[PDB]
Design a protein around this ligand. Sequence first.
Ligand SMILES: O=C1N[C@@H]2C=C[C@H]1C2
Ligand SMILES: O=C1N[C@@H]2C=C[C@H]1C2
Lengths: 175, 175
Amino acid sequence: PRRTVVLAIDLQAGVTPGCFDEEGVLSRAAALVERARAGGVPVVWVHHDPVGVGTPEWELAAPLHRAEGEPLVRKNYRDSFADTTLRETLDELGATHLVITGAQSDFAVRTTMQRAAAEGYDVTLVSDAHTTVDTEWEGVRISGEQIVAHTNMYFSGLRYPGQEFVIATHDHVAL
Amino acid sequence: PRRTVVLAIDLQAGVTPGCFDEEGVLSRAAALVERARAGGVPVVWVHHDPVGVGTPEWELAAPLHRAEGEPLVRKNYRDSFADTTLRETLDELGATHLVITGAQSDFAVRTTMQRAAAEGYDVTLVSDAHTTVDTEWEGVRISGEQIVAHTNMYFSGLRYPGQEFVIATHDHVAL
Ligand SMILES: O=C1N[C@@H]2C=C[C@H]1C2
Ligand SMILES: O=C1N[C@@H]2C=C[C@H]1C2
């Protein structure tokens, strides 16, 4: 019995500013959430507490809004499963398939989606609904755009025995 | 009781050719393995069977050589723990800390090191002893060099409760 859950990670006012394609990604994530709501697909929100619990920066970035009855999981690390209520929350919902949108592509999203895969979930990465910022290391710059693209490349070929991984845009993903 | 194990991933003749800094990375991985051997630190080799089991491409890339008594784990997926004897092998050795070198940075290395973190290991990524190739996706090119650099950036800040993650060069890593 496949049950899909939309998992929206760290889409917070203090996280998304300055990210690649910021307005576009936030708009498509919002559309995805609305599509899920209309289809009766559960949405689970994840917030990174070190952004500053109790501050406006911690709250959802516009135009995102949490609806009544939608779980919210708070975390202190990149992995949304690490020392959190996520697994318990997903088990209570009977989730088998996670549709992931959020930020940042190379940190919380990267770590959570691979953890999800390791735990045995089917996972769909929403290719046009995650983002991050430009960075540089070891004397080379890597743009947010490159990281998003490389992230989608990686996920499109990800495989685990008995598990299914799908890459799709926000308007194509099967909910 | 911290026990360090050097985990050398997919350093195969059919994998490394064309990779960024190919000769350098292979030479430093070899040096690391020799340092580990001299220090009595166990080395565990991982080979990707889909490279072509029984073919020369599957075997270790020069100048790497496996020593007597060094375990070898065979796998079919990016995650070296997925449907393999890795965990059993590491448990038998009492491993608590994994020092990771190998290829490719963005596939088998990326997936194995994050899985290792999820499983609860302390992990050290050997910053100058992993590599991959240039690629492109969504109309943007990302060089092997950029992927290696971004991989090291990611790992340097990785955190889990009660776990330690270290980034260090092959000649600096504590064995
Ligand atoms: O990807 C991410 N989301 C939170 C802010 C930075 C990391 C943690
Ligand atoms: O990183 C990697 N090592 C093997 C060849 C490609 C992936 C699997």
